[PDB]
Amino acid sequence: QEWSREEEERLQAIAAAHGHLEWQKIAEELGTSRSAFQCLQKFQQHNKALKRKEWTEEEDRMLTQLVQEMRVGSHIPYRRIVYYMEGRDSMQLIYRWT
DNA sequence: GAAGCGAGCACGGTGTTTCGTCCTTTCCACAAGATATATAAAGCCAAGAAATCGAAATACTTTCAAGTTACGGTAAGCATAT
């Protein structure tokens, strides 16, 4: 069965109290009866730290370098930027060049 | 003239070849092997065609990468009001 949007709060609370070291013990203490890899996929999907925020000036240097070095015509492989630049996903990373 | 000095030819050898069996075949022959045929019940071997199932190819599903429409909220420098 899927989540009910009622375990992520306790999940992240216990993970912050323990330090995100051993998810197995966190999953066992939360009492979800599912594998750690099954609840972590939803925790990291509801987590907010995955995204980034307003763009600085120094990162524009890297963004322009990764373009002058492996860009191709009108298409920019933003996946390479996501691989090199951490925090930036694929969806909203296109606005950095649009 | 018969005793002292140089004398043929029958004879006695190997070695080489010839000749003439005994050899095992090729070939042939008289007596007798299935060789045709009649079953017949049994189970198994074994060389051809027809139905069935495994593999996979090209096809369509389906799912996963890209991304640009449409969309909702804040921040700066010029214009304008009493």
Curated annotation (Swiss-Prot):
<feature type="domain" description="Myb-like 2">
    <location>
        <begin position="50"/>
        <end position="98"/>
    </location>
</feature>
<comment type="function">
    <text>Part of the SNAPc complex required for the transcription of both RNA polymerase II and III small-nuclear RNA genes. Binds to the proximal sequence element (PSE), a non-TATA-box basal promoter element common to these 2 types of genes. Recruits TBP and BRF2 to the U6 snRNA TATA box.</text>
</comment>
<feature type="domain" description="HTH myb-type 1">
    <location>
        <begin position="1"/>
        <end position="49"/>
    </location>
</feature>
<feature type="DNA-binding region" description="H-T-H motif">
    <location>
        <begin position="23"/>
        <end position="47"/>
    </location>
</feature>
<protein>
    <recommendedName>
        <fullName>snRNA-activating protein complex subunit 4</fullName>
    </recommendedName>
</protein>
<comment type="subunit">
    <text>Part of the SNAPc complex composed of 5 subunits: SNAPC1, SNAPC2, SNAPC3, SNAPC4 and SNAPC5. SNAPC4 interacts with SNAPC1, SNAPC2, SNAPC5, BRF2 and TBP.</text>
</comment>
